[PDB]
């Protein structure tokens, strides 16, 4: 076969003097190395068998080293070499559509990635001059997110909640929903995505690449993967490597997005890795600088000014909490780095509100209110009509009857609550959202039954995409819902309501 | 186990000869200062809870009598003490002015004067 022989003539057998430190111990991943005089801190050192490692502690006698791999091929008396480089990963657009490990080697088997430029995992966030405020929107296609808790481009938003409530699905409808902009024509409405899998078994990450490839979502993302089987210095290095492929886009013009799933598993890989280096424990045996661990990460998510390129880098960190308690140590340290949050609960998921977003508590510094112009009209009034609902709609035990007074307002909420529910891996558009939200707030649904609105939605939505395609194209193009555009929609809802149930 | 006063400069003179140049019965040099706690090599005759008096003018109080050094808390700033500064003795537990010349005056915790009228005129003392 011609492929094996051409791989062996391209191999370079270069030999040079190394700089070399004999091993004194090896246990549980830490290799105290005698020698290694001129070593830097955070330098990448290379064992004899092909392993790789990073020298963290410097000390007068020994040199502490942690291993990127497995510590059973390493025996006392081995040889540790010097590369001569603080730890760096490859970068580029050439990694797009791949699954890679935490140092940039492909675990999909499509071959060697041809990459040209290398970028550190420990670089610095930009300061005060080269930013700008948040001008643009980032559409998720969820209807409880886009209307009530909008997210700008360049804003760190925290998805927080328990296990098995919707934290991964929320951030995968977002990956799917940008399919419509990426095959379009303008280069400033796209959104290239990145998913970082920390502490997850391979029978979830090889299954999420399936869900992202029938919908052809994988042609514009990267998956940096550090599974639960990996060395504890490989789950620590993963978000600092994934964030550094995001800043190929942001430092060259485009717009990126990055999900850390999750960041409660980049902390217990720092607690273990830095207890076996004999560093004294803090609270819950976490180190002193877990706040400095997350903060030097979540400040690269910038929004540059237009004299640098104007690119953005959103971030969506996921956080799993125990028993729904938000006052823990690692939650509160990362609530106060992000601009806004999305509080996912369990009693919302089980009563029926799915996606289970607490729209009361899901606060957001609105991002210079870049919702969009037409959604401001219909979800401006929706925000207040739902807020009016929640103050007054928690009895479950009625004794008196005020249908002219109270029962009209709470009938507007259940029509807007059951409108907000959604499916899974089928995200809408924004003008298909303006139409369905128009029909809810304008009183055109109070003569239905609430057990029929989820049935009313898909029959409505199929009618407008089929028969009214030139209608929705004037909302997406002109931005606003104009007064003559208010006129045309006034018949369509009432013509359909005249013949919906028959 | 290494011991605090086993540094490379303490052992180095004892290989040369006897320690006649410093007496160590009354004055002792400082091994290591940090965050208001000093370590002093020498001072063999220091009583427990005795004021000492550093080289830069500050004061002290002896709290840890240990088999190779003494650990003394420092009154005041620590940017005046260093490594190699001779410490001396006063010879008593700390004492404060006491009388009726205090009435109407404002004093700190060592009996000094802060209100700027003038020095206290008492003719008595007392151990705290």
């Amino acid at each position: 076969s011609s492929i094996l022989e051409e791989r062996i003539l391209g191999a370079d057998t270069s030999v040079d003097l190394e700089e070399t430190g004999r091993v004194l111990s090896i246990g549980d991943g830490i290799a105290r190395v005698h020698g290694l005089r001129n070593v830097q801190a955070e330098e990448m050192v290379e064992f004899s068998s092909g392993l790789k490692g990073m020298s963290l502690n410097l000390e007068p006698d020994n040199v502490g080293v942690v291993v990127f791999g497995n510590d059973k091929l390493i025996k006392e008396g081995d040889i540790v070499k010097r590369t001569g480089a603080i730890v760096d990963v490859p970068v580029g657009e050439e990694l797009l559509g791949r699954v890679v490990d935490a140092l940039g080697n492909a675990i999909d088997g499509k071959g060697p990635i041809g990459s040209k430029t290398r970028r550190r995992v420990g670089l610095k966030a930009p300061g005060i001059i080269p930013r700008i405020s948040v001008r643009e929107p980032m559409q998720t296609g969820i209807k409880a997110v886009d209307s009530l808790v909008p997210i700008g481009r360049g804003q760190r938003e925290l998805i927080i909640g328990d296990r098995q409530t919707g934290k991964t699905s929320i951030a995968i409808d977002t990956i799917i929903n940008q399919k419509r902009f990426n095959d379009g024509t303008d280069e400033k409405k796209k959104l290239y995505c990145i998913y970082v899998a920390i502490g997850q078994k391979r029978s979830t990450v090889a299954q999420l690449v399936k869900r992202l490839t029938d919908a052809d979502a994988m042609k514009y993302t990267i998956v940096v993967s550090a599974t639960a089987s990996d060395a504890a210095p490989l789950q620590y290095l993963a978000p600092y490597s994934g964030c550094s492929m995001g800043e190929y886009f942001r430092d060259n013009g485009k717009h990126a997005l990055i999900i850390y799933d999750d960041l409660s598993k980049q902390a217990v890989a720092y607690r273990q890795m830095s207890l076996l280096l004999r560093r004294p424990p803090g609270r819950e045996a976490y180190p002193g600088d877990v706040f400095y661990l997350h903060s030097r990460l979540l400040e690269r998510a910038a929004k540059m000014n237009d004299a640098f390129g104007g690119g953005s880098l959103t971030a969506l960190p996921v956080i799993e909490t125990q028993a729904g308690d938000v006052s823990a140590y690692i939650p509160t340290n990362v609530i106060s780095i992000t601009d806004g949050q999305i509080f996912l609960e369990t009693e919302l998921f089980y009563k029926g509100i799915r996606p289970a977003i607490n729209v009361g508590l899901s606060v957001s510094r609105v991002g210079s209110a870049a919702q969009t112009r037409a959604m401001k009209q219909v979800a401006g009034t929706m925000k207040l009509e739902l807020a009016q609902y929640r103050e007054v709609a928690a009895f479950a035990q009625f004794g008196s009857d005020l249908d002219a007074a109270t029962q009209q307002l709470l009938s507007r909420g259940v029509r807007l609550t059951e409108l907000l529910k959604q499916g899974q891996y089928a995200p809408m558009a924004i003008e298909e959202q303006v139409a369905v939200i128009y029909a809810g707030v304008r009183g055109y649904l109070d003569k239905l039954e609430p057990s029929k609105i989820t049935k009313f939605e898909n029959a409505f939505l199929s009618h407008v995409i089929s028969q009214h395609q030139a209608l929705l194209g004037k909302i997406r193009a002109d931005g606003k819902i104009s007064e003559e555009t208010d006129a045309k929609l006034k018949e369509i809802v009432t013509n359909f309501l005249a013949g919906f149930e028959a | 186990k290494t011991g605090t006063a086993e540094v490379s400069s303490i052992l180095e003179e004892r290989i040369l000869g006897a320690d006649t140049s410093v007496d160590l019965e009354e004055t002792g040099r400082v091994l290591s200062i940090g965050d208001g706690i000093a370590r002093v090599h020498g001072l063999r005759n220091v009583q427990a809870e005795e004021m000492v008096e550093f080289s830069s003018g500050l004061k002290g109080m002896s709290l840890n009598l240990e088999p190779d050094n003494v650990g003394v808390v420092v009154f005041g700033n620590d940017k005046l003490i260093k490594e190699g500064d001779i410490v001396k003795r006063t010879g008593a537990i700390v004492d404060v002015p006491v009388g009726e010349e205090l009435l109407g005056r404002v004093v700190d915790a060592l009996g000094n004067a802060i209100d700027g009228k003038g020095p206290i005129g008492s003719k008595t003392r007392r151990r705290v």
Binding site: T13, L17, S49 | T2, S8, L11, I15
Partner: protein
């Protein structure tokens, strides 16, 4: 306190505390090349079934191990500053680590003219025409007025080369280069 001469090794631990207090004290008065001749004569009288019977015995007395060695260290050959040092270790409780200090003082005194030798690790030994080059082409590297030394250890798992370590250098040319042909199997 005073400043002291920097030893060119600077080891650490309970050895290098005492093994630098001896190097600094003897470099004063230029007692350096002499004192190694005296430390190699206590390096023979320590190994004795009456001397080592109480140099590491806990239960004799705290005091009588001080007079018994001070009478011993003075009468036979020498009364330098080492007679205070043996009296210094014995007064503190570090008599167990006494062979450690002289093995620490020897490696500290060796580098004042020495090399920290290389380690050729190839195969069954060689002839004179290929070894006297490597005992001379290994002198062309250093170039600082020195007289080199060396160790040899035979290993067959290295199939076809030699490794050498001038200090911490490790120029490796061996049969590791079969594992470097993973790139043929690595796409």
């Amino acid at each position: 306190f005073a400043k002291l001469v920097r030893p060119p090794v600077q080891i650490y631990g309970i050895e290098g505390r005492y093994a630098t207090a001896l190097y600094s004290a003897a470099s004063k008065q230029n007692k350096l090349e002499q004192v190694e001749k005296e430390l190699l004569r206590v390096a023979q009288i320590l190994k004795e079934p009456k001397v080592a019977a109480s140099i590491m015995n806990p239960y004799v007395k705290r005091s009588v191990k001080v007079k018994s060695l001070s009478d011993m260290t003075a009468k036979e050959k020498f009364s330098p500053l080492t007679s205070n040092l043996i009296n210094l270790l014995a007064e503190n409780g570090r008599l167990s680590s006494t062979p450690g200090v002289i093995s620490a003082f020897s490696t500290m005194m060796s580098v004042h003219r020495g090399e920290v030798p290389c380690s050729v690790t190839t195969a069954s030994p060689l002839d004179e025409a290929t070894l006297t080059e490597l005992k001379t082409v290994l002198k062309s590297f250093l170039s600082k007025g020195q007289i080199l030394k060396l160790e040899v250890k035979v290993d067959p798992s290295i199939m076809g080369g030699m490794i050498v370590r001038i200090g911490e250098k490790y120029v490796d040319m061996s049969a590791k280069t079969k594992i470097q042909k993973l790139s043929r199997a690595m796409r």
